[PDB]
Write a protein that holds these residues in place. Structure first.
Motif, mmCIF file in Angstrom:
data_model
loop_
_atom_site.group_PDB
_atom_site.id
_atom_site.type_symbol
_atom_site.label_atom_id
_atom_site.label_comp_id
_atom_site.label_asym_id
_atom_site.label_seq_id
_atom_site.Cartn_x
_atom_site.Cartn_y
_atom_site.Cartn_z
ATOM 1 N N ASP A 1 -6.224 -0.138 7.100
ATOM 2 C CA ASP A 1 -5.039 0.624 6.742
ATOM 3 C C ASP A 1 -4.391 0.165 5.444
ATOM 4 O O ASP A 1 -3.381 0.751 5.039
ATOM 5 C CB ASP A 1 -4.004 0.559 7.873
ATOM 6 N N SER A 2 -4.930 -0.853 4.784
ATOM 7 C CA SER A 2 -4.374 -1.336 3.530
ATOM 8 C C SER A 2 -5.074 -0.683 2.342
ATOM 9 O O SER A 2 -6.187 -0.164 2.450
ATOM 10 C CB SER A 2 -4.492 -2.857 3.438
ATOM 11 N N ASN B 1 -12.754 -3.836 7.118
ATOM 12 C CA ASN B 1 -11.813 -3.819 6.004
ATOM 13 C C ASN B 1 -11.708 -2.431 5.384
ATOM 14 O O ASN B 1 -10.603 -1.950 5.111
ATOM 15 C CB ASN B 1 -12.232 -4.846 4.955
ATOM 16 N N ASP C 1 -0.655 -7.225 -2.669
ATOM 17 C CA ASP C 1 -0.305 -6.064 -3.480
ATOM 18 C C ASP C 1 0.402 -6.444 -4.775
ATOM 19 O O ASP C 1 0.484 -5.615 -5.687
ATOM 20 C CB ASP C 1 0.572 -5.105 -2.673
ATOM 21 N N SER D 1 -4.575 -2.281 -1.190
ATOM 22 C CA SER D 1 -4.922 -3.318 -2.157
ATOM 23 C C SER D 1 -6.247 -3.985 -1.807
ATOM 24 O O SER D 1 -7.069 -4.251 -2.692
ATOM 25 C CB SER D 1 -3.804 -4.356 -2.236
ATOM 26 N N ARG D 2 -6.471 -4.267 -0.523
ATOM 27 C CA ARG D 2 -7.696 -4.948 -0.119
ATOM 28 C C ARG D 2 -8.923 -4.063 -0.292
ATOM 29 O O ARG D 2 -10.012 -4.569 -0.583
ATOM 30 C CB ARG D 2 -7.582 -5.415 1.332
ATOM 31 N N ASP E 1 -3.522 -11.578 5.904
ATOM 32 C CA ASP E 1 -2.174 -11.042 6.044
ATOM 33 C C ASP E 1 -1.438 -11.560 7.273
ATOM 34 O O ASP E 1 -0.283 -11.178 7.485
ATOM 35 C CB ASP E 1 -2.228 -9.513 6.087
ATOM 36 N N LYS F 1 -3.825 5.307 3.459
ATOM 37 C CA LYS F 1 -3.673 3.888 3.763
ATOM 38 C C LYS F 1 -2.477 3.364 2.981
ATOM 39 O O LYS F 1 -2.569 3.154 1.768
ATOM 40 C CB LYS F 1 -4.943 3.110 3.419
ATOM 41 N N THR F 2 -1.355 3.158 3.673
ATOM 42 C CA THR F 2 -0.106 2.759 3.035
ATOM 43 C C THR F 2 0.436 1.434 3.557
ATOM 44 O O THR F 2 1.585 1.089 3.256
ATOM 45 C CB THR F 2 0.957 3.848 3.216
ATOM 46 N N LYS F 3 -0.347 0.686 4.329
ATOM 47 C CA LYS F 3 0.135 -0.574 4.880
ATOM 48 C C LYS F 3 0.362 -1.597 3.775
ATOM 49 O O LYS F 3 -0.455 -1.745 2.863
ATOM 50 C CB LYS F 3 -0.857 -1.123 5.903
ATOM 51 N N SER F 4 1.482 -2.308 3.866
ATOM 52 C CA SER F 4 1.800 -3.331 2.883
ATOM 53 C C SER F 4 0.889 -4.543 3.056
ATOM 54 O O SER F 4 0.276 -4.754 4.105
ATOM 55 C CB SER F 4 3.262 -3.757 3.001
ATOM 56 N N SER F 5 0.807 -5.347 1.999
ATOM 57 C CA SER F 5 -0.015 -6.547 2.016
ATOM 58 C C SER F 5 0.608 -7.587 1.100
ATOM 59 O O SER F 5 1.428 -7.271 0.235
ATOM 60 C CB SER F 5 -1.458 -6.253 1.590
#
Ligand SMILES: [Zn+2]
Lengths: 179, 649, 629
Positions: free
Chosen positions: C594-595, C590, C626, C597-598, C283, C619-623
């Motif tokens: 905070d993600s 990992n 996604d 999708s991963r 990222d 865990k709402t961090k964008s990636s």
């Protein structure tokens, strides 16, 4: 829209030109072939399909003439993504171009240059590659960053990349003349 | 690990009791283990050659190996006496024979093919059995028929002898590549035989591919060769609408199911499940009505031929003969219905066996005995290959050029020894041929054999003095033509280094050959070559649009296994790291569009197909749409089955 | 002959002159013959390939051979295409071949990495190789067994080397055996290269004849390992060409089998490692801000001892007493022996990505492509290749052992055996000395004191010792001395020239340093109880001895994502203090990130969805990944 093939060395051509067998190119680019035949021959699609069926069982000449013109007038030239199973190294997947079609019908080998071989970190032992063509014109410009031209400079340091250099016997050939 | 101390070399002296599968490969105490262990697999994968030859440098161990391998030849266990022979077809026929020491009866069946596996086989060189006829006598040691490998006098052979040299040709031999002349390619050959099972139902019919309406030849004849790689094509027929469907049967239609095969058809057999009265009237089902009848005739023959033997008071018959008799008497009876895969089929099903010769083509692999594996890259006319034009024997031309770069790096010096031995044999043979009468000619040979293998000299002398003058002259002429065989054992008893040094020192008149347009001394020898199983057409695959899985994703289809198509239409999957390596570029939307329009979204796939087919062929400017993909729906359904949902923002 | 290169390079008859020269050399080479004398001198060969002609540039004279002139025009195409004259600055000696890579890299940076110059260089490679192929056919390269034999008669020193067997009248350790092989192998390369022969061009170019591998064909092999790394104490005494024996044959078979087992196992587990690192370190993104604004006190500090570490820090800023953020000088060696302050991405400030100052001057080179993905592929691929290619080298080195003063004066150790000077002296061993062996469960007495009559000297054996099988038979009853709590072993009972004690030795595996790199990431052995300033210093030390050539920027980015900041706000670095941080294993880094999708696409599906140990619900961090979901 995919195929698998083998590797066979080819000489006397630029570093980013390959030659594919007659059979695989006659079926991967199948739909575009029918469009070219339909206008020239002046028949509908149903009648043209049975013509393509007979032109693939045995080698002929009428189909080949339309085949050669397709790879010459199209924009950017027909291209595809070539990778290797498995990919663990940088440059294991490339973006090459098509510049020759083998006349033989029994030939079923992909002819590539020798310098490009070292990038894949493979050899002619008999491995099988995967070929995936690309179609959209707008999508091509985004994939041009993966061409071997862009890999010429080394991302690690910024010097000339050693992989795309003289290797194996070509080192010995120059030394004999140079000294 | 000090357990090695038990091993003592005193007892392991002059006996090869510790070698398995290495008895064939000579000079086994020179190459390393990593390269030697590949020879076992290479021998395990070695197809049959049409023009098989015995090796020039033999290890004196292959003859017994050939004798004790009973999978290729069939001899007579006991003295027989021919009773009868009956025909079944143009080629295949059987014969019933009787013992002279026990009174039992046995059968021998002549064939023309053998199905070793799904693709590869061989052709029987049945010659002696054919000459046997009309109540002759078979002895103990006679061999009825044999494979193509075995020669006339039981000598084994599994490869060819080719003139070879170490050379570099326009960097076409980089890594492991081989160029080969056209004559050597003509010499090298291979066989291929395959069986195809076609099926016919009551509704289906067979198109008039061969012949006009007078002879509705649905399938090729017994000995004819197929054309256009199409054996037979069947078209479904519907009761409701056939007026506009069966107007012309001489051409293919849109909805057909053809069968693809290549070669020459040798054997057929037809099994039926319909009453003959209904089959007698159908005009299109004509050729079958021929063959079936002929087949039945054969069966009737046996029921009238040896019915006095088994049904008589003697009844001294072997198990095979009785089983065959019962099987053949099954058919002529009434109210019999066959079954296939534990099911009762409705329409008849036949069998075809097709034989074909496949020549050497680019992409194949050929290896030597010491595991110097290579790949054919580019064949040339014999004119281009290097030739010697200065020495006494001008004309010799190398047939294969090997990579000189990786000989010492590969750690296997046996090939050099073999080539040097064959070169010294060539020189001594030419020197003998130049001059000398038969009185002293053999002496010139014996001296050379004295410094290579001391064991061979005694047998040489015995064999030479055993014959008379004419046969000795013929043998000398033959050894002049072909070449002097040299024998040496794999482990104990062979030439090393000091013997080679002495042999080189003794002969002082030897110099390297001077080629033309090379300006570098060169040596050409003869080496042994064996073909390998690996072929380019056994793994090549391509796919445009095949059948889709139940979910909607593309999936493997089983049509190539039943010879319904040419290519194995199997897609290649994108691996775990392939997506990431594609994502190496900062662009991601293009990757997503490609994946969605290729194998995820049905509407996008159809739109792309249409936009590609109709429009501008030279320049394409497709514009994908936005529709929820299938995988998203699958994941949403599964997660809502679990009890969780993915929410945006 | 004298051609004005400046005129020819801009003559506009480039194709005519180059084609004519490219044909005369080949045409003449296919007429004469080559002669070899195999002596110290060289045969008076006549060729057009070696003639002296004066080359003039800007009036200067540079005496060069005809063979070098043609190679100059082929490699100097770009000057003609851009219509720019050539000066002596770009000229270089063409005798060697490694200098060629320095010429290309002096061409890219001279024209500013333009897209046009990349195409021209791509053309030079194609034309250079095509004309190289024609030389091989006309000249020819052959390998012949008679070449070695013919050289034997002329050079006497070679005959002794070919027939050389290890003397067996002197005691030799496993360290002395390696010395003999290296001593003989070194002399072989001097004789072959200096004198004329068939293989002269095969060795000088050094392409096809590996120095270590070629020695086994001619000279003796040495020693080989076993299935468990222990050195087999039966060295091979015969070279490959001279022949092999049955006992030697068994040892060779062990080496071959180990290759198959290792190769098969590595294939089964190959992509397991590269999946873990790739999923996390993806990222990262590059911003174009000039400077984030990190405080100077938070700059990373590193220690430089060897010149190799200086090579790992190129085109990056460093701090000086009077100069601030000045570029580092690789050539200058005054920086060695002192610590420096190197700004690094691990202490970057921007919430989006690394800036220009923190990353360095490589920003222009890797501006278009992704930054994170270059690092992971640049490291895993060399790591896996070394674990395969280097391990294929079965031959292993040996380490010296200091037995001690009294050990040397009384026992001359030969391979896996021990022999005393005088058999009169006995040995006194206490009951507690014996210990149970880890593997064979036999008695091993690491330390003992010999009973040399009235005198006695303690022995500190560095390695484990195994008692003699013969003497142990009588030890059960006769030599068993429990009355004095001290065993008595009279060596006079032992016969002369008999085994006394056998010791086994484990070779120093060349793959051992590589494995510890993997263990650093996962095992939590060292990473837990240290700060960032020590890990990166420790990390470089691992790569230094490993031999991997990787720039510091592509190795430190892994540390940047391995470290986790509790405050979850990189702007906190602007303050004077260093906010608290904890390092995690790459597997747990990992999952406890905070993600979203991963986390789902990595591993442990049941644990993340059923319980809340990792707290998946927050865990709402964008990636960038996604989009697939
Ligand atoms: Zn910063």
């Amino acid at each position: 829209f995919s195929a698998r093939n083998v590797i066979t060395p080819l000489i006397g051509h630029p570093i980013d030109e390959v030659a594919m067998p007659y059979k695989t190119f006659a079926e991967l680019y199948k739909f575009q072939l029918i469009n070219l035949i339909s206008k020239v021959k002046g028949i509908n699609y149903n009648e043209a399909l049975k013509f393509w069926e007979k032109g693939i069982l045995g080698f002929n000449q009428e189909l080949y003439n339309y085949m050669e013109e397709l790879i010459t007038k199209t924009k950017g030239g027909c291209t595809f993504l070539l990778n290797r199973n498995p990919t663990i190294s940088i440059g294991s997947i490339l973006y090459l171009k098509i510049g020759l079609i083998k006349k033989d019908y029994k030939d079923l080998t992909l002819g590539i240059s020798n310098n490009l071989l070292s990038a894949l970190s493979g050899d002619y032992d008999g491995d099988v590659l995967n070929i995936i063509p690309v179609f959209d014109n707008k999508m091509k410009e985004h994939f041009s960053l993966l061409s071997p031209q862009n890999f010429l400079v080394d991302r690690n340091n910024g010097r000339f990349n050693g992989d795309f250099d003289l290797q194996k016997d070509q080192i010995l050939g120059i030394f004999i003349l140079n000294n | 690990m000090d357990d090695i101390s038990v091993i003592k070399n005193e007892d392991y002296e002059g006996s090869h009791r510790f070698l398995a599968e290495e008895l064939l490969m000579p000079n086994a105490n020179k190459t390393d283990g990593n390269r030697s262990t590949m020879f076992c697999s290479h021998l395990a994968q070695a197809v049959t050659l049409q023009k098989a030859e015995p090796p020039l440098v033999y290890t004196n161990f292959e003859n017994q190996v050939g004798k004790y391998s009973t999978a290729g030849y069939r001899k007579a266990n006991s003295n027989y006496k021919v009773i009868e022979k009956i025909y079944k077809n143009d080629y295949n026929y059987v014969l019933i024979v009787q013992d002279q020491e026990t009174g039992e009866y046995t059968l021998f069946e002549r064939a023309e093919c053998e199905f070793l596996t799904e693709h590869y086989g061989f052709q029987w060189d049945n010659d002696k059995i054919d000459s046997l006829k009309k109540d002759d006598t078979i002895e103990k040691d006679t061999v009825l028929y044999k494979n193509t490998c075995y020669d006339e006098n039981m000598n084994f052979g599994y490869g060819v002898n080719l003139n070879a040299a170490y050379f570099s040709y326009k960097n076409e031999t980089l890594e492991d590549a081989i160029v080969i002349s056209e004559s050597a390619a003509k010499k090298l050959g291979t066989f291929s035989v395959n069986k195809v099972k076609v099926s016919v139902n009551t509704n289906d019919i067979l198109l008039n591919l061969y012949g006009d309406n007078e002879n509705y030849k649905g399938f090729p004849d017994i000995g004819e060769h197929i054309k256009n790689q199409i054996i037979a094509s069947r078209r479904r027929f519907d009761y409701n609408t056939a007026l506009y469907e069966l107007k012309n049967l001489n051409e293919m239609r849109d909805s057909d199911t053809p069968f693809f095969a290549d070669g020459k058809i040798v054997d057929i057999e037809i099994f039926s499940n319909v009453p003959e009265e209904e089959l007698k009237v159908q005009k299109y089902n004509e050729q079958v009505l021929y063959y079936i009848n002929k087949q039945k005739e054969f069966s009737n023959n046996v029921y009238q031929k040896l019915k006095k033997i088994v049904e008589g008071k003697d009844n001294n018959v072997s198990d095979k003969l009785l089983h065959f008799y019962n099987n053949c008497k099954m058919r002529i009876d009434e109210n019999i219905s066959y079954t296939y895969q534990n099911s009762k089929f409705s329409g008849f099903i036949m069998e075809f066996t097709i034989l074909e010769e496949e020549p050497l083509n680019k992409g194949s692999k050929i290896t030597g005995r010491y595991g110097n594996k290579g790949v054919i890259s580019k064949i040339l006319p014999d004119d281009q290959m290097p030739t010697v034009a200065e020495g006494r024997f001008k004309g010799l031309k190398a047939d294969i050029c090997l990579n000189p770069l990786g000989v010492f790096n590969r750690l296997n010096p046996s090939q050099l020894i073999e080539q040097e031995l064959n070169w010294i044999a060539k020189f001594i043979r030419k020197d003998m041929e130049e001059a000398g009468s038969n009185e002293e000619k053999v002496s010139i040979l014996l001296d050379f054999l004295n410094r290579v293998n001391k064991e061979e000299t005694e047998l040489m002398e015995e064999f030479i003095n055993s014959l008379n003058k004419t046969e000795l002259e013929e043998f000398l002429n033959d050894i002049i033509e072909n070449g002097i065989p040299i024998c040496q054992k794999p482990f104990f008893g062979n030439i090393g280094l000091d013997e080679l040094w002495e042999l080189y020192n003794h002969y002082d008149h030897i110099d390297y050959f001077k080629c033309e347009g090379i300006s570098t001394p060169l040596i050409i020898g003869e080496i042994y070559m064996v073909r390998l199983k690996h072929e380019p057409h056994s793994k090549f695959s391509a796919r445009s649009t095949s059948f889709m899985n139940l979910r909607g994703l593309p999936a493997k289809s089983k049509n190539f296994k039943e010879h319904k198509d040419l290519y194995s239409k199997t897609p290649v999957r994108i691996g775990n790291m392939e997506i990431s390596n594609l994502s190496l570029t900062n662009e991601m939307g293009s990757i997503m569009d490609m994946l969605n329009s290729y194998s995820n979204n049905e509407t996008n796939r159809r739109e792309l197909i249409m936009q590609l087919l109709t429009g501008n062929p030279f320049d394409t400017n497709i514009d994908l749409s936005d529709v929820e993909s299938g995988t998203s729906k699958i994941l949403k359904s599964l997660f809502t089955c679990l009890g969780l949902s993915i929410d945006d923002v | 002959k004298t051609y004005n290169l400046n005129d020819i390079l801009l003559s506009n008859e480039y194709e005519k002159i180059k084609e004519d020269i490219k044909e005369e050399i080949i045409n003449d080479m296919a007429s004469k013959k080559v002669k070899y004398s195999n002596t110290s001198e060289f045969a008076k060969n006549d060729f057009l390939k070696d003639e002296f002609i004066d080359l003039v540039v800007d009036g200067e004279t540079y005496e060069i051979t005809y063979g070098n002139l043609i190679t100059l025009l082929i490699v100097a195409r770009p000057f003609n295409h851009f219509k720019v004259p050539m000066t002596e600055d770009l000229l270089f000696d063409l005798s060697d071949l490694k200098e060629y890579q320095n010429y290309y890299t002096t061409l890219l940076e001279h024209f500013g990495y333009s897209n046009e110059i990349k195409s021209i260089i791509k053309d030079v490679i194609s034309e250079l190789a095509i004309f190289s192929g024609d030389i091989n056919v006309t000249f020819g390269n052959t390998v012949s067994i008679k070449s070695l034999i013919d050289l034997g008669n002329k050079v006497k020193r070679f005959r002794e080397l070919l027939h050389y067997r290890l003397p067996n009248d002197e005691a030799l350790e496993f360290n002395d055996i390696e010395a003999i092989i290296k001593k003989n192998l070194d002399e072989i390369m001097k004789i072959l290269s200096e004198t004329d022969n068939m293989l002269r061009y095969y060795i000088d170019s050094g392409a096809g004849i590996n120095s270590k591998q070629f020695g086994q064909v001619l000279s003796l092999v040495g020693s080989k390992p076993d299935l468990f790394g222990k050195i087999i104490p039966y060295p091979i005494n015969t070279s490959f060409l001279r022949g092999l024996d049955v006992r030697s044959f068994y040892i060779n078979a062990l080496g071959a089998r180990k290759a198959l087992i290792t190769n098969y196992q590595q294939v089964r587990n190959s992509g397991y490692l590269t999946r873990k690192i790739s999923m996390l370190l993806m990222d990262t993104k590059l911003i174009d801000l000039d400077d984030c604004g990190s405080h100077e006190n938070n700059y990373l500090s590193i220690n430089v001892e060897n010149k190799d570490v200086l090579k790992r820090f190129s085109k990056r800023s460093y701090l000086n007493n009077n100069g601030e953020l000045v570029e580092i000088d690789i050539n200058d060696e005054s920086l060695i022996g002192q610590v420096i302050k190197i700004p690094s991405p691990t202490t970057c400030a921007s919430n989006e990505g690394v800036c220009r100052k923190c990353y360095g001057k490589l920003f222009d080179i890797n501006k278009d492509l992704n930054i994170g993905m270059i690092a992971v592929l640049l490291l895993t691929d060399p790591l896996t290749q070394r674990l395969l290619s280097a391990k294929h080298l079965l031959e292993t080195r040996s380490s010296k052992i200091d037995w001690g003063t009294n050990f040397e004066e009384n026992f001359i150790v030969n391979r896996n055996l021990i022999y005393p000077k005088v058999y009169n002296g006995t040995v006194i061993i206490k009951e507690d000395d014996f210990k149970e062996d880890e593997e064979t469960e036999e008695q091993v007495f690491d330390t003992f004191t010999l009973k040399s009559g009235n005198r006695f000297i303690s022995i500190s054996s560095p390695m484990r010792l195994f008692l003699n099988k013969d003497l142990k038979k009588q030890l059960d009853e006769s030599f068993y001395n429990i009355e004095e709590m001290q065993f008595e072993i009279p060596l006079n009972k032992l016969d002369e020239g008999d085994s006394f004690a056998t010791f086994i030795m484990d070779n120093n595996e060349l793959s051992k340093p590589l494995r510890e790199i993997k263990d650093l990431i996962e095992t939590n052995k060292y990473i837990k109880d240290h700060n960032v300033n020590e890990v990166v210093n420790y990390f470089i030390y691992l790569l230094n001895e490993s031999g991997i050539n990787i720039q510091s920027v592509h190795s430190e980015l892994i540390i940047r994502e391995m470290m986790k900041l509790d405050d979850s706000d990189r702007t906190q670095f602007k303050n004077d203090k260093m906010p608290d941080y904890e390092i995690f294993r790459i597997t747990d880094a990992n999952l406890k990130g905070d993600s979203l999708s991963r986390s789902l696409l990595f591993e442990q599906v049941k644990k993340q969805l059923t319980t809340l140990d990792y707290d998946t619900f927050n865990k709402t961090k964008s990636s960038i990944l996604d989009k697939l979901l």
